[PDB]
């Protein structure tokens, strides 16, 4: 460019020629000159001038504002409430379009996080992803996806195209392994089991209408049909579809990863998977 041609003429760049970007630094003012010296910006003698004014929120001796308001449980149990990151079909379509979420294979929270499509924070009480209806009208992809929460309209968009959506619960410990699997294989521990939902969440994940992972499989076809009629689309028979096996693939309710059983150890250095043989240890994991 023309800028580089200017460098050719100009003298060498060196440590003696450096300069910061203009206005990059403000100048700090010492209390030395008459303008900023003398009383030094503090005012005439007094409590605020000696530096001993009362604490923040003190109002000179009347009951402060933040003390005379009734105490109310807006934030009770905030640290215990569950948080589900929202994923919109617009974001899902956009990720697929640019190749960042491969639709050929099943989509699980690992793949979504692995494609920088969602950011999961188990420390801040993230327990998964909830599918968001936004973008349903323009959603034209056939995919198999597992999400901890889903909405009635969000499910309809996935299924109408012939995809599969199932809702699966991951416990706080399992989610952290799911989100960052490799920073776990490096520890050297065996893969833990996946714990069942708490009593409060059991109804949601055992219900077909929500596509629960613990729900009765025989009851799905009725649920799929009713949703199709309500939203005015024809339910597509996915058994005929060539990639039916991939669409129907589902991990065991006590399994975190698709091809890895609980209890195995992943020797990444040697590209091996140590597996136990003991009976009590195999009964513990297979339970």
């Amino acid at each position: 460019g023309t800028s580089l041609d200017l460098l050719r003429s100009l003298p060498r760049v060196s440590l003696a020629n450096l300069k910061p970007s203009p206005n990059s630094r403000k100048r700090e003012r010492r209390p030395r000159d008459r303008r900023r010296g003398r009383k030094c910006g503090r005012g005439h003698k007094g409590e605020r001038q000696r530096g001993t004014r009362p604490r923040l929120g003190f109002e000179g001796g009347q009951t402060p504002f933040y003390i005379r308001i009734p105490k109310y449980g807006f934030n009770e149990g905030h640290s215990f409430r569950h948080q589900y990151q929202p994923l919109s079909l617009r974001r899902l379509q956009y990720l697929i379009d640019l190749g960042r979420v491969d639709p050929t294979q099943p989509i699980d929270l690992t793949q979504l996080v692995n494609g920088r499509g969602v950011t999961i924070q188990p420390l801040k009480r993230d327990y998964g992803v909830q599918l968001v209806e936004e973008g349903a009208d323009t959603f034209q992809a056939k995919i198999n996806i597992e999400v901890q929460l889903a909405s009635e309209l969000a499910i309809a968009a996935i299924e109408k195209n012939g995809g599969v959506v199932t809702t699966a619960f991951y416990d706080p410990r399992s989610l952290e392994i799911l989100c960052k699997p490799i920073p776990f294989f490096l520890r050297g521990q065996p893969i833990p089991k996946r714990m069942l939902p708490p009593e409060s969440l059991v109804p949601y994940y055992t219900d077909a209408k929500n596509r629960g992972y613990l729900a009765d499989p025989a009851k799905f076809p009725e649920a799929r049909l009713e949703l199709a009629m309500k939203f005015g689309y024809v339910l597509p028979d996915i058994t005929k579809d060539e990639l039916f096996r991939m669409l129907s693939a589902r991990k065991d309710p006590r399994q975190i990863f698709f091809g890895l059983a609980p209890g195995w150890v992943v020797n990444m250095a040697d590209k091996k998977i140590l597996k136990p043989t003991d009976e009590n240890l195999l009964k513990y994991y297979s339970s």
Binding site: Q189, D270, K272, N280, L281
Partner: protein
């Protein structure tokens, strides 16, 4: 010591069988599991009783 096996695999020298719980360790895990994590059948049964009382 485990951390050495996961990073470096076999060359660490950790005896593989030492990566899994020991007999006494296994008993602690199961006993703790029963106390704090009920089975699916019990959870559904407990839920049903609450609904009947509510009804």
């Amino acid at each position: 010591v485990a951390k050495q096996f996961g990073r470096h695999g076999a060359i660490s020298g950790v005896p593989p069988a030492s990566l899994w719980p020991t007999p006494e360790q296994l008993r602690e895990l199961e006993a703790e599991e029963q106390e704090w994590y009920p089975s699916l059948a019990t959870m559904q049964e407990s839920l049903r009783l609450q609904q009947q009382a509510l009804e």
